[PDB]
């Protein structure tokens, strides 16, 4: 019996990642962020963008 | 993430031929859709996959 | 000034092209492949950039 998993990478959100969940937000600082499967490094600030 | 609790990927079965990373390492990779396809083949058809 | 703006603009937009790789962002390749299969594709991407 052969079981293969076909994967497609899209923009839909993923709600479950790893054993750790919250990792409480820290703003106005340079941090490594992973949000909705998007991994990057940058400063997290508030803006007025709607 | 599919399931991190039950992992048989380590030396639990007869034959393991894997590419990339094992199911243990899939916990850090986020993908959208998962289609699990189940089918039965013969002995000589394993090399054709 | 338009040639300088267009030169910086072309210089940034070429970063988004994959140049024969899976994706232009290194996090998608590093978050999937192991370092040994990954070194051929990252070296092709760096050589293109």
Short mmCIF file of C-alpha atoms in Angstrom, two decimals:
data_model
loop_
_atom_site.label_atom_id
_atom_site.label_comp_id
_atom_site.label_asym_id
_atom_site.label_seq_id
_atom_site.Cartn_x
_atom_site.Cartn_y
_atom_site.Cartn_z
CA UNK A 1 0.00 0.00 0.00
CA UNK A 2 1.50 3.30 -1.18
CA UNK A 3 0.34 6.57 0.39
CA UNK A 4 1.66 9.83 -1.04
CA UNK A 5 0.69 13.35 0.05
CA UNK A 6 0.32 15.90 -2.76
CA UNK A 7 1.06 19.41 -1.42
CA UNK A 8 -0.03 22.79 -2.81
CA UNK A 9 1.37 26.03 -1.34
CA UNK A 10 -1.23 28.83 -1.35
CA UNK A 11 -2.17 31.93 0.66
CA UNK A 12 -4.86 30.28 2.82
CA UNK A 13 -4.29 30.56 6.60
CA UNK A 14 -3.04 27.65 8.71
CA UNK A 15 -4.39 27.56 12.27
CA UNK A 16 -2.13 24.91 13.90
CA UNK A 17 1.66 25.16 14.18
CA UNK A 18 3.85 23.11 16.51
CA UNK A 19 3.47 22.37 20.21
CA UNK A 20 3.90 26.05 21.15
CA UNK A 21 1.08 28.47 20.34
CA UNK A 22 0.85 32.04 21.66
CA UNK A 23 4.43 33.45 21.92
CA UNK A 24 3.06 36.79 23.19
CA UNK A 25 3.57 39.71 20.82
CA UNK A 26 6.42 42.19 21.28
CA UNK A 27 6.16 45.31 19.14
CA UNK A 28 8.44 48.28 18.30
CA UNK A 29 11.49 45.96 18.18
CA UNK A 30 13.44 43.91 15.66
CA UNK A 31 12.22 40.29 15.88
CA UNK A 32 11.89 37.12 13.81
CA UNK A 33 8.18 36.71 13.03
CA UNK A 34 6.21 33.82 11.53
CA UNK A 35 2.60 34.80 10.73
CA UNK A 36 0.20 32.58 8.70
CA UNK A 37 3.16 30.60 7.37
CA UNK A 38 5.12 33.71 6.28
CA UNK A 39 8.57 33.75 7.88
CA UNK A 40 10.56 36.98 7.97
CA UNK A 41 12.59 39.38 10.08
CA UNK A 42 11.47 42.94 10.75
CA UNK A 43 10.17 45.54 13.16
CA UNK A 44 6.51 45.13 14.14
CA UNK A 45 4.72 48.47 14.51
CA UNK A 46 1.18 49.84 14.45
CA UNK A 47 -0.02 51.84 11.45
CA UNK A 48 -3.27 53.45 10.33
CA UNK A 49 -3.65 51.21 7.26
CA UNK A 50 -7.22 49.93 6.89
CA UNK B 1 0.43 20.46 11.18
CA UNK B 2 -1.08 17.00 10.78
CA UNK B 3 -0.20 15.11 13.98
CA UNK B 4 2.92 15.31 16.15
CA UNK B 5 1.70 12.91 18.85
CA UNK B 6 1.77 9.61 16.93
CA UNK B 7 4.87 9.23 14.75
CA UNK B 8 5.75 5.81 13.33
CA UNK B 9 8.37 7.29 10.97
CA UNK B 10 11.31 6.02 13.09
CA UNK B 11 12.18 2.31 12.51
CA UNK B 12 8.61 1.07 13.12
CA UNK B 13 7.95 -0.54 9.70
CA UNK B 14 9.64 -2.73 7.10
CA UNK B 15 10.92 -0.30 4.46
CA UNK B 16 11.46 3.48 4.53
CA UNK B 17 12.38 5.37 1.37
CA UNK B 18 12.04 9.09 2.03
CA UNK B 19 12.90 12.29 0.24
CA UNK B 20 13.35 15.70 1.83
CA UNK B 21 12.44 15.65 5.52
CA UNK B 22 10.74 13.08 7.76
CA UNK B 23 7.22 13.56 9.24
CA UNK B 24 8.87 14.62 12.53
CA UNK B 25 10.36 17.66 10.75
CA UNK B 26 7.06 18.56 9.01
CA UNK B 27 5.98 20.44 12.18
CA UNK B 28 7.97 23.52 11.07
CA UNK B 29 6.63 23.58 7.48
CA UNK B 30 3.25 25.19 6.79
CA UNK B 31 1.29 24.10 3.72
CA UNK B 32 -2.31 24.73 2.64
CA UNK B 33 -4.02 21.58 1.33
CA UNK B 34 -3.27 17.90 2.01
CA UNK B 35 -4.58 15.13 -0.26
CA UNK B 36 -3.91 11.62 1.06
CA UNK B 37 -4.03 9.15 -1.84
CA UNK B 38 -4.27 5.43 -1.09
CA UNK B 39 -3.59 2.70 -3.65
CA UNK B 40 -2.09 -0.79 -3.90
CA UNK B 41 0.65 -1.74 -6.38
CA UNK B 42 2.85 -4.76 -7.11
CA UNK B 43 6.44 -5.52 -6.16
CA UNK B 44 8.09 -4.45 -9.41
CA UNK B 45 6.03 -1.23 -9.58
CA UNK B 46 7.76 0.31 -6.53
CA UNK B 47 10.67 1.60 -8.65
CA UNK B 48 8.23 3.38 -11.00
CA UNK B 49 7.16 5.81 -8.25
CA UNK C 1 16.69 61.00 -12.14
CA UNK C 2 14.30 58.64 -14.00
CA UNK C 3 17.23 56.44 -15.12
CA UNK C 4 18.44 56.36 -11.51
CA UNK C 5 14.95 55.54 -10.23
CA UNK C 6 14.38 52.89 -12.89
CA UNK C 7 17.83 51.41 -12.16
CA UNK C 8 17.10 51.03 -8.47
CA UNK C 9 13.58 49.82 -9.32
CA UNK C 10 14.86 47.15 -11.75
CA UNK C 11 17.51 46.21 -9.16
CA UNK C 12 14.86 45.58 -6.53
CA UNK C 13 12.30 43.84 -8.80
CA UNK C 14 14.89 41.33 -10.07
CA UNK C 15 15.12 40.06 -6.46
CA UNK C 16 11.57 38.74 -6.82
CA UNK C 17 12.39 36.59 -9.85
CA UNK C 18 13.15 32.97 -8.96
CA UNK C 19 16.02 32.56 -11.52
CA UNK C 20 15.23 28.84 -11.96
CA UNK C 21 14.54 28.03 -8.29
CA UNK C 22 11.37 27.06 -6.43
CA UNK C 23 10.80 30.44 -4.80
CA UNK C 24 12.51 33.80 -4.49
CA UNK C 25 12.35 33.83 -0.70
CA UNK C 26 15.04 31.79 1.02
CA UNK C 27 12.71 30.87 3.89
CA UNK C 28 10.55 28.65 1.67
CA UNK C 29 13.56 26.64 0.48
CA UNK C 30 15.25 26.52 3.90
CA UNK C 31 11.99 25.58 5.61
CA UNK C 32 11.54 22.56 3.33
CA UNK C 33 14.71 20.97 1.96
CA UNK C 34 17.62 19.58 3.95
CA UNK C 35 20.95 21.48 3.63
CA UNK C 36 22.52 18.94 1.17
CA UNK C 37 19.73 18.89 -1.44
CA UNK C 38 19.14 22.59 -0.77
CA UNK C 39 22.71 23.73 -1.60
CA UNK C 40 22.31 23.15 -5.35
CA UNK C 41 19.16 25.27 -5.61
CA UNK C 42 20.42 28.06 -3.35
CA UNK C 43 23.72 28.17 -5.31
CA UNK C 44 21.78 28.49 -8.57
CA UNK C 45 19.69 31.30 -7.05
CA UNK C 46 22.74 33.20 -5.71
CA UNK C 47 24.58 32.83 -9.04
CA UNK C 48 21.56 34.30 -10.83
CA UNK C 49 21.19 37.22 -8.41
#
